[PDB]
């Protein structure tokens, strides 16, 4: 009712105003000294931007559609907004997956590391991830696809029950390829770190690893359950509201889950973020 999409809205600002506040300390700790680490900072830089214009582009129209007026709108609008969703979060997934493997090309082959992984390189990755995720998204802006409101949600999103190939598409590029990639990618990593925990010491890295899988499935997997589920059986009458507010809850937790799981584990940045924030306070 429009009790339960008030309640929805205000509690989608709570995450996001956190998140805001966050990113932005791991945008000082990380742009005060440039000479950080190797080729990362701008990897971490590109995660953080695009987060952070995902959540400033996104969060005002997501809660101004829900407030009772101009209700009519136009399939134009929220037909050019899902698209630029969906880029943003095509380009932080593509980054992601570009940071696991350079993080498994770092921990494996430890001495010829720099040989491999030059500015060009990381430049030329930068844009390539860039222009993937400008180009291979938004198709339905000129082709298959297609954004509709539903007076039932009000979210007006796309429906998938038009054009199965791009459904297809997005399923794949979102959960398959990311997924088989940090798997395989990690597996070698934990071999290598049970190998030296046994030489050292004559389970703690499982926890890594599965919190990061969780959290990233956490993050990502119902929205392509319900994308997938929709081509099937129909979504207006046959879904609860509670499913779908659920849905769009969990789909915008990355925003908050980024930071703390690929800024604050690392050993490095969450000393020099406490010794700033223990300084300023
Ligand atoms: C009237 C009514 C009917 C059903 N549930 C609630 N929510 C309650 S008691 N606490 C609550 C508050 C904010 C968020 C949540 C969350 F959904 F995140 F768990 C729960 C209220
Ligand atoms: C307060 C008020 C008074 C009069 N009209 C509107 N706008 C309406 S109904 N739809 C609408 C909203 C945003 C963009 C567009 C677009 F131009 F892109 F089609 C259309 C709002």
């Given at each position: 009712?429009?009790?339960?999409?008030?309640?929805?809205?205000?509690?989608?600002?709570?995450?996001?105003?956190?998140?805001?506040?966050?990113?932005?300390?791991?945008?000082?700790?990380?742009?005060?000294?440039?000479?950080?680490?190797?080729?990362?900072?701008?990897?971490?830089?590109?995660?953080?931007?695009?987060?952070?214009?995902?959540?400033?582009?996104?969060?005002?129209?997501?809660?101004?559609?829900?407030?009772?007026?101009?209700?009519?709108?136009?399939?134009?609008?929220?037909?050019?907004?899902?698209?630029?969703?969906?880029?943003?979060?095509?380009?932080?997934?593509?980054?992601?997956?570009?940071?696991?493997?350079?993080?498994?090309?770092?921990?494996?082959?430890?001495?010829?590391?720099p040989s491999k992984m030059t500015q060009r390189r990381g430049y030329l990755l930068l844009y390539g991830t860039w222009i993937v995720a400008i180009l291979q998204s938004t198709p339905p802006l000129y082709g298959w696809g297609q954004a509709a409101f539903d007076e039932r949600n009000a979210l007006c999103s796309m429906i998938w029950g038009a054009s199965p190939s791009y459904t297809i598409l997005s399923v794949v590029s979102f959960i398959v390829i990311p997924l088989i990639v940090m798997i395989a990618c990690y597996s070698v990593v934990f071999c290598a770190a049970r190998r030296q925990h046994a030489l050292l010491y004559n389970c703690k890295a499982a926890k890594v690893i599965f919190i990061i899988i969780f959290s990233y499935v956490l993050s990502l997997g119902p929205y392509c359950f319900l994308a997938v589920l929709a081509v099937?059986?129909?979504?207006?009458?046959?879904?609860?509201?509670?499913?779908?507010?659920?849905?769009?809850?969990?789909?915008?937790?990355?925003?908050?889950?980024?930071?703390?799981?690929?800024?604050?584990?690392?050993?490095?940045?969450?000393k020099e973020i406490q010794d700033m924030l223990k300084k300023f306070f």
């Open positions: 009712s429009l009790a339960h999409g008030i309640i929805r809205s205000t509690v989608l600002v709570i995450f996001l105003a956190a998140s805001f506040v966050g990113n932005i300390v791991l945008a000082l700790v990380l742009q005060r000294k440039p000479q950080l680490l190797q080729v990362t900072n701008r990897f971490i830089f590109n995660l953080l931007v695009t987060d952070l214009l995902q959540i400033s582009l996104v969060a005002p129209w997501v809660v101004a559609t829900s407030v009772p007026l101009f209700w009519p709108l136009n399939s134009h609008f929220c037909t050019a907004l899902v698209s630029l969703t969906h880029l943003f979060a095509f380009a932080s997934v593509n980054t992601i997956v570009v940071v696991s493997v350079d993080r498994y090309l770092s921990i494996i082959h430890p001495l010829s590391y099937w059986v129909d979504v207006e009458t046959q879904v609860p509201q509670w499913v779908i507010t659920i849905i769009i809850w969990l789909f915008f937790l990355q925003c908050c889950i980024h930071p703390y799981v690929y800024g604050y584990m690392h050993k490095t940045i969450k």
